[PDB]
């Protein structure tokens, strides 16, 4: 027997590396500097252990999303003059009228201006007296006039010499052997949607509703859900604002609200009522497999906390809504209509749970309509006394890994090793 | 045809028929330097394997016979239960301890064959 060297054998080892775009008026997620796109092979006899909570494709996607956010915030206006004292009178307790003194293009003169601020942006200091909410411990940098926020599908294509393994099991709860894997050059399209308490536009489970969590017996860990049929939602903002351009320096301009046109009608997002009861009924059937066939599943409303996390906040049309989902989560369960949700708007944003970095979103002249999907929740359990038959699932969320960890629960990146030596009966003369 | 890594679960004997398949898929602002440092790694990683073949003398070949004799203390199974019961993922553990000294006998078995063919030409 004589050693023989083979180059190009199918062996792989776990690894972690850097992935890049591929994606077919500038977007924040700059689809103008990502590679253009272009292939799925079946691996037989193969069984490959997975784990979706010790994934690393997630901790790279959370940093790439943040760092794309605040490079598209650097190059344009910084509104540090707006921290002054306002004299705000009621427009009619929701809108204010808020006139103040602010500079001109001539450094020594002053200007008297005005603008309409929502009540969620001014905190008073004891007409009346007010100031902007993020003025102590933040620095407001206006959003920037010609950049969009709408998500665009991005494919995460791995480098050459690495490969991405995809679990095609149709009931995969993200942990354990997957007897049917594949090999993909790069993923399907993942929309980087920002949301809370309800995952929007999603991607649907194939056969049944799936409940996924890190440590079920622990009550401090969230519980991602994944519907298998969408439950579409309908948002609107009736009023029709006007845009006015304050000038606050040489080459700066502050896009403030002008006048409302009409009566003030609240902004909402409805639901179909009968659909929301079937869907909440298929969740309970699939949620008894993990807690007991004779247990009372009681849904409740938000527990409390910061307004970014006790309410269903999202972003469509360019104007950041903050809806109040209490009528969705109700209805204790034992063994034409529409639900109307009252949504409030803001204009100064603190997105990624950062401290001391904020943003001001210019108004959207026009009427805002919005047609979304609801393809998941993020519940959380309340720890009882282990001697009851009732479980209360309040919606939670906030942490942002949990949105994306619901899309990269099936992928795994590996590293090829193409060199091998084996015995044979050949000899080199 | 089976494709890239298609023969991952097949036996060592029928998965040596698809060496060219993996052999041609090993080379090819936030996105501006994530891109650039990803290519200078796929190349430097690849050139450290085409140099190893050159040292042993197998350059440009996928299957290459050598002169080292298979020591019976590395794996003492017979040929019928290596090329017909194993998969490369299984065979590549069993010699995980003895791969760093097979690479040391292949390297200097060629250095002796360089200075044996060089002398022979002198006559």
């Amino acid at each position, epitope marked *: 027997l004589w050693v023989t060297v083979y180059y190009g054998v199918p062996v792989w080892k776990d690894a972690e590396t850097t992935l890049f775009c591929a994606s077919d008026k500038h977007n924040v997620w700059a689809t103008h500097a990502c590679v253009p796109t272009d292939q799925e092979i079946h691996l037989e006899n193969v069984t490959e252990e997975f784990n979706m909570w010790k994934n690393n494709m997630v901790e790279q996607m959370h940093t790439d999303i943040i760092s794309l956010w605040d490079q598209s915030l650097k190059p344009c206006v910084k509104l540090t003059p707006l921290c002054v004292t306002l004299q705000c009178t009621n427009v009619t307790g929701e809108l204010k009228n808020c006139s103040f003194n602010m500079t001109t293009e001539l450094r020594d003169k002053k200007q008297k201006v005005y603008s309409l601020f929502y009540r969620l942006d001014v905190v008073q200091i004891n007409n009346k007296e007010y100031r902007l909410i993020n003025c102590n411990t933040s620095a407001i940098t206006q959003a920037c006039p010609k950049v969009s926020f709408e998500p665009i599908p991005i494919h995460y294509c791995a480098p050459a010499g690495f490969a991405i393994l995809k679990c095609k099991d149709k009931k995969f709860n993200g942990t354990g052997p997957c007897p049917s894997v594949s090999t993909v050059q790069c993923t399907h399209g993942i929309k980087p949607v920002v949301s809370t308490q309800l995952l929007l536009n999603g991607s649907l489970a194939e056969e049944e509703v799936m409940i996924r969590s890190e440590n079920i017996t622990n009550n401090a860990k969230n519980i991602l859900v994944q519907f298998n049929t969408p439950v579409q939602i309908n948002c609107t903002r009736p009023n029709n604002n006007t845009r006015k351009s304050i000038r606050i320096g040489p080459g700066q301009a502050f896009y403030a609200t002008g006048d409302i046109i009409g009566d003030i009608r609240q902004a909402h997002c409805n639901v179909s009522k009968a659909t929301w009861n079937e869907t909440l009924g298929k969740v309970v059937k699939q949620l008894r497999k*993990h*807690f007991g066939n004779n247990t009372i599943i009681r849904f409740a409303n938000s527990s409390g906390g910061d307004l970014e996390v006790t309410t269903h906040s999202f972003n469509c049309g360019g104007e950041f809504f903050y809806c109040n989902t209490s009528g969705l989560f109700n209805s204790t369960w034992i063994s034409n209509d529409s639900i109307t949700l009252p949504c409030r708007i803001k204009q100064i944003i603190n997105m990624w749970q950062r401290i001391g970095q904020a943003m001001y979103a210019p108004p959207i002249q026009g009427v805002i309509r919005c047609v979304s999907n609801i393809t998941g929740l993020i519940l959380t359990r309340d720890g009882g006394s282990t001697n009851s038959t009732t479980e209360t699932f309040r919606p939670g969320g906030g942490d942002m890994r949990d949105n994306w960890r619901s899309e990269l629960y099936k992928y795994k990146v590996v590293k090829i090793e193409p060199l091998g030596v084996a015995p044979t009966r050949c000899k080199r003369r | 045809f089976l494709g890239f890594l298609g023969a991952a679960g097949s036996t060592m004997g029928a998965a040596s028929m698809t060496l060219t398949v993996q052999a041609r898929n090993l080379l090819s602002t936030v996105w501006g330097i994530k891109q650039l440092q990803a290519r200078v790694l796929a190349v430097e990683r690849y050139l450290r394997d085409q140099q190893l073949l050159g040292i042993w003398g197998c350059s440009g070949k996928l299957i290459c016979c050598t002169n080292v004799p298979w020591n019976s203390s*590395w794996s003492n199974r017979n040929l019928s239960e290596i090329w017909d019961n194993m998969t490369w993922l299984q065979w590549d553990k069993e010699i995980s*301890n003895y791969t760093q000294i097979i690479y040391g006998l292949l390297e200097e078995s060629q250095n002796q064959q360089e200075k044996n063919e060089q002398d022979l030409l002198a006559l």
Partner: antibody
Amino acid sequence: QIHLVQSGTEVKKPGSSVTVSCKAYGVNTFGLYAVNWVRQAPGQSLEYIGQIWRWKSSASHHFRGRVLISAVDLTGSSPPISSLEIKNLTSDDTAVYFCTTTSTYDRWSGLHHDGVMAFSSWGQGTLISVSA
Amino acid sequence: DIQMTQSPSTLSASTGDTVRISCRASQSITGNWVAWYQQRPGKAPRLLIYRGAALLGGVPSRFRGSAAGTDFTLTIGNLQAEDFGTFYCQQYDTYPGTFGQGTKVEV
């Protein structure tokens, strides 16, 4: 951390059946771990009974037909759990019974030779005595 | 099925001594697929060397084993008084993985 807790002491009579269970606190789930049941005759060499691995249990070459290894995964109330019954018990089968688990996530671990395993997290021991 | 005749059947030494323990297979294990335990009286055995010479976490580096052919040997450095007990060499080369017989280390 990982902690293993087996049931308590028990005594039986020949011709009966007895069950011992093992509740593991800290196992992610039995998909990524494997459970092997061993036995130590009084002051003797150890002995291996059976196992569950990737959810397919099997028994040894001297026990087949007289044993049943079963297990159930996580649940909002109890940790993952495994069980062992000994049917047609006899005076020979008195010994201490251990519950053992090994990780099987990493394919290049070295604690498992494609099914045959080394044991890295041991229980506490259950003593089973049969007499009249 | 592999069988191992662990030897010496029992040895004794005091602290500060270097101790070797042998273990022989019946066939050759050419992958270094053996492991070593330690059973204090009554408690449960603790794995401390797997795959020839690899050391689990937490086990002090004072231990060491070697692997060659059919002779597998375990060595203890500068012995310490709580390290008296029993040891076991197990093979996991082929199904099923049998154990040794045990060799106490009395004071």
